[PDB]
Symmetry: C5
Subunit: 269 residues, 5 copies
């Protein structure tokens, strides 16, 4: 598809907003531990690793239908171009809480250890599903069958197997520990991610309504929404909550998006 | 309301200043532990979680009345105060530089005591109306004190985004930080700025200077517009946790200073 | 006082340099522990908290006298020295790179000893008058030593902001840092810069170079203006805590160098 | 060779993409622990230090063949491919977000297991010939496996800079990172970028995005020139250490992606 | 000396490169522990702190002779080499990525050993004369090895700033870092750059690239001017501490490379 100039004039710009709730494993809003994974079930050995589905954080994704733009026989057509995005992880302050049931910081007179450890933050804005690459810590892990993971895993999948590809086309089904953004593709999506590992690492997060991210590429072109559909994807693992018993649950937070779009001329394919 | 151009000429600018004391739990200037929470009381179980009001840090809010601008509300165009920029500062930072305070020893009984440390939260906002808030909690089965403003009729959904859990920050020392946070879906007429570092024992990090200004104009060059000539300042500045010798623990907060520059903005009379 | 333009010409610029020694508690050059506080004496209880003067770090402050500018004090306009920029350095940083000093072993008795670490506080200021202070303390029941300048008749309000608790940094080694901080509601005529990192055992981090200048001009392009041709330089550089083998502890401070560039500013006579 | 101007016009630009798999020690894709080292085997003494080849992470290198540019090597000028910019990404970062893997418990046997952490090393390079390396080791009495490429006949001088200990990164998975580092006295025709964080148990930190480009041009506007139409891509990405339940330890590495943009550069025919 | 304009024309620029090996205490290339200090010997008491010379890291320094510039030294103006920019690199950073070296186990005897960590100190300078130094120590009652250069007649004042405690870095591996640091009140003709992170066990952080240049020109656009056609390069790069199985400890350092670009600068002849 040959991309042409930006369409000017009145009504050329639009704005959408949305939020994606986290998918840490308890993914139904009636779940007692909604926003958390179930207690981590640890592998007995390399050969015997069977994580429960509810213990595995997955990517969130939503598809937004935009206003129809196009006569599909005219020489040029228009597409929605995502220009910029304001995005924020919501409910950061809920972590500022030392009375929750948990493990004591010192003895039984102290507060409880707050959520900490490994964090993973990612958002993407694209005109189609985020393209994914498969890679696991262990090729001998047996994943739950109703989740989307790598078929016919071999040791190569502990590194880069160019056959292990997928599209993020379902909310709450693609394990973060299996899939990551494919940098060899995603020509039509901008994605942004940061990771800090560790068992007990302090989480660090910002929040403001003053920051915007521009989505335009080196040529001045943002993601173009095929079939007038905008794709928002995210994961926001903000750490691990430990219970008194010492069992542990991933903690995630929801993400807000506010995307500005304009109208972009393309040559009819 | 349609926003027009900046009003130029003499006396088009004004400047205000204010401080906000922290609301950590002991919120009365006579309280022995003013500027701290009461000893954290830990939930016995998920089902039975009743934090005392005095153990829950809340937001600080102050409303500042600005000079009256409009003589005749029938004119085609009207003026509003526009917040353009703020200098802001957490005060008393060096009060944490203190190893003789009562507490838990760093090593044995010959050493100094462990200074304030652990989870920190800093936020300020400047707005032309109350900061709009979104409700979200660590646990939906916590029972909050009824003399505070918390999410009505909580369900497990409230551990994530429930779009019906919305509030306004309209009272000082009443809205707990562990329940409410700024709503990025609204707040078109406020600017907020926040940072969080967690952990049980993390060292606090803070800066102080009179050389730094934050500009409040949005992408259209328009700052917050003060509805009814009212400027809303909001803040929380939790600088960590102090541990007592008994190992009981208290949140510590510090005051925040504001210096806001404002200018007159023409609007189209909405009636 | 109405500020006018900068004065041009030859000899319109001057430059001064000075150093300020740390005031950690042992403030006399002949003290065995000069540059350190005395062993921290801890409160038995909140109501029983009597920190020795020698255990409390205080601000350093120097007044530099500048060439007189107005031989005739009745002219319709007067000149003032305007502080334009400063290069400043915390000296002797590498003295901390030392694992043999008497103290607490890192591991067992075969290993090096724990270096200076924990809470750091760095501040400098340059003004044409004394730094303006706001008092605020961790505990309003602490009894401070009388030979120091602290908040008069403390009440619980002083654990937060009491607008009556103000002071001027006008004496070297007398204003404790745990009591006073720079007052952001004043200090129109001073530039100050601070950085704090807490913790019991935090690694300190410091840089040193002669390539970096801080510009002191405000948003109207005006620096601090030196009243009575006097320049005020203030500082504190607490670089951490040294722990002794007995587990007693001392604050460790380092000196600060200032190199200040000043120009002649015109002002209308009041 | 004398470097002239950039050749303009249609078809003057190309781009290539490639990925490099990590060489942590288990370097054969059929290895059960591919993408990890074997269990680290520790020296019994300084004199007795024989690390297994499979426990030693090595540099990854690939050579990308570029389209032949010159139809007649007799002309006064010829064309070379010039690497202008690169997008590069460490893939599978999120595979580390895994608390269920067999290993050492964070707390007791009810908790998750400790994830990969400790020393990290990341490096990428784009050049028009092999990366030039300098040898330097932690201990000169270590006996390295003979089928790896290491320093010949080491002496204690090799625990610092011996100007004779030089090599070319011209083999994949053969040059140990603990023996070789990029040589800053050479590599005129390569650009390299590296970052290291040590420590026994440090949390790893990594970013990923498709919005970031690195420009490869030097201060004269010239990027790496590809000799014999070959582009050399080199990397190492050690993300830390995995600890087993037995407390044995394995290095963990991740693959790296490269997307390089090149253009045609005119040179004078030697 | 009055400095005039830059001299143009061909052949007005030159480049040099050099490397400085670390002087950590074992400073002879045939020393078994070259590139390390000897096991730290700790003070028994403040009054008897007698550190062995081989335990004490010192500054590296090299002088580079540049091409001679003035035939006739009776001309009203002369040329000096002016250092304009430097590319510098700490070499061998990846040798630290090594967990099989004899040492202290991370966990038990099945695990790797703890790598180099703790206090780091990085400094480089480029100047047209010796680096000017200021003296300051942790304790004036330490007795330093006589064959090193330290502060003569130390008194307690030397635990802070004594304006008489001055030296020049004119000898390689003789001036202890724990005694001497760059004197910011002098060094008008040298650019130095330093960073320090303390602590016992701190993870070291280091970057390496060939893409970064530091410009050495001052505020008036003048770099270091080379007196008698001599260029002085100085450095220390302590990357932390290696711990042995026994728990004895040794400082670890790495070499530094320099690539400096020089141009010809006109000066007025002082006759
Ligand atoms: Ca591709
Ligand atoms: Ca909205
Ligand atoms: Ca004021
Ligand atoms: Ca060379
Ligand atoms: Ca001087």
């Amino acid at each position: 598809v040959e991309v042409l100039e930006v369409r000017t004039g009145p009504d050329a710009i639009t704005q959408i907003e949305a939020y994606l709730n986290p998918r840490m494993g308890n993914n139904n809003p009636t779940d007692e531990l909604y926003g958390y994974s179930a207690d981590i079930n640890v592998a007995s050995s390399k050969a015997s690793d069977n994580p429960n589905a509810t213990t595995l954080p997955t990517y969130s994704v939503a598809v937004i239908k935009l206003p129809m733009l196009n006569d599909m026989t005219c020489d040029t057509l228009l597409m929605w171009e995502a220009v910029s995005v304001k995005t924020e992880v919501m409910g950061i302050s809920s972590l500022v809480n030392l009375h929750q049931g948990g493990k004591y910081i010192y003895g039984s007179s102290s507060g409880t250890i707050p959520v900490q450890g490994t964090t993973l933050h990612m958002f993407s804005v694209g005109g189609e599903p985020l393209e994914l690459q498969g890679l696991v810590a262990s090729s001998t892990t047996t994943y739950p069958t109703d989740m989307v993971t790598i078929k016919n895993m071999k040791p190569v999948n502990q590194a880069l197997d160019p056959n292990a590809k997928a599209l993020l086309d379902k909310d709450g089904k693609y394990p973060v520990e299996v899939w990551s953004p494919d940098p060899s593709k995603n020509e039509n999506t901008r994605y942004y991610g940061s990771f800090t590992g560790g068992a007990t690492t302090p989480p660090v997060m910002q929040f403001t309504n003053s920051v915007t991210t521009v989505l335009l590429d080196e040529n001045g072109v943002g993601p173009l929404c095929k079939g007038d559909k905008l794709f928002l994807s995210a994961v926001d693992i903000v750490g691990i909550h430990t219970n008194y018993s010492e069992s542990q649950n991933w903690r995630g937070l929801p993400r807000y998006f506010n995307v500005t779009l304009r109208k972009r001329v393309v040559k009819n394919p």
